């Protein structure tokens, strides 16, 4: 996964991904959202990276890079960028147990 | 349509005579009121919303003679034999022609209605004497064109028919070699599927990777025999069967993609399994095995359809779920040194029921399917004993 702090950061990270995915987490469920963030990270990037690989994850802290990629996309912020552009956009907050069913439905092509 | 565009047309000009005769004169209502002002601003409105309906094709006429003028000038170009070349690039006006002919006589009927229509309901002349002459111009080009392109058609077809034998020798050629193509990358991405982390990690993505830039080439190749079929039309059935026979190779190709995604997900799956034999702790490890179990399961289920040896990785998956049963039996803290070590003597492991922190990785050589049920025994024998022990923990007391 690359960790981002600009929707410019976020959007480097998924250039820089491009045979795979790089999704780009704005912000998040608030609620103490920075450590929380880092450790979500830290077992997302295992499951993105390592079980399922086919995604890295930067968690864009805390810019809009969401709301610009989405901008980009005419298609917390969650921007999936292939081959660093954006090609889905989905909004919301969710809790860890929402992250796992996430999981499972990964990786998209 | 354009026949609802020509009834629109003449409703707004019955619409217009109503409008003008609808204002009427000043009326009186105790203080005097004149529309005079008013209804001059209603006509200029009426007048626009006209306008657009009367000069919808007023610029696209313009447009398809500017358009339908550059068909004539290539006609106007005409010369048989002489260079190849030149025939590559004239031959596919005709096939162009051809198309725009039956197209464009269709199109032709609605076009002669909205100028006729118009005139219905429009009393004002447009383009004045301009507008029917450009009808007449088009018809006598229109002509002289279908002239041409019979004239043309034959030369065409003469020339053509040699380079249709031209055509099939470069095609055989092209072919043989497009068949060696997609062998090549069937060959490419069932290796990589074929191949399974688990435990190798990072050289798998790679032979995904240029897995991708081999199937990127074949695309472009694709790519040059649908234009090379186009170029050659003849309405071949052959052409458009090759370029099917492509496509299903790009199938296969995205289901070898979707397989190496598959097998990046086990393979993180794995690592965590080997991270968590160093971490090791019993209490720990239960709660690990039942979860894992779980996740290994809705993976199996998950993966369907694809390309075939999917079975053979598949069965990987299996004997990672067993042996993620055969280390929840351990799990268990009922067993002691002594019954470890009967256990440990049938079993042939040097370490312990709790020997260190890296033990689960140890655990891991034993085989689960191979090993659970004589590991199960013991942690069955185990718990028996305890419920004696503990027994004789009541009258020991």
Known sequence: TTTVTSEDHFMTFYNENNK????????????????????????????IDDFEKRIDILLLDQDKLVTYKNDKFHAPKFLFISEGKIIDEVLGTNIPVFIEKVNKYIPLS | ??????????????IQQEISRIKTPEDISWLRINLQPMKTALDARVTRWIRVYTDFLVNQFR???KNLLDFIEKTKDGIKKNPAD???????????????????????EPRREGIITRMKEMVTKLKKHNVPITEKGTDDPLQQIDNANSNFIEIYGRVFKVKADIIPLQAEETQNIKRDLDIFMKEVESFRKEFMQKSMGYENINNAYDTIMVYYHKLTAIEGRAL?????????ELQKSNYKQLKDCMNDLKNLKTMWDAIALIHFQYNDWKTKPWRQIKADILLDTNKTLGTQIKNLPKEIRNFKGYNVIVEKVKNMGTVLPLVSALHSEFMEDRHWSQLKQITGTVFDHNSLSFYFEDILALNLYKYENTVNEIVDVAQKEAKIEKKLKNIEQ
């Open chain 1, 20 to 47: 795979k995915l790089i999704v780009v987490d704005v912000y998040p469920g608030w609620s103490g959202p920075c450590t929380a963030m880092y450790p979500t990270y830290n077992q997302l990037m295992i499951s």
């Open chain 2, 1 to 14: 349509n354009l026949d609802l565009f020509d009834e629109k047309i003449t409703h707004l000009k019955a």
């Open chain 2, 63 to 65: 447009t398809t003679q």
């Open chain 2, 86 to 108: 030149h025939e590559n690039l004239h031959d596919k006006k005709l096939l162009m022609s051809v198309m725009k002919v039956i197209s464009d006589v269709k199109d032709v």
């Open chain 2, 228 to 236: 090379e079929y186009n170029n050659l039309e003849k309405a071949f």
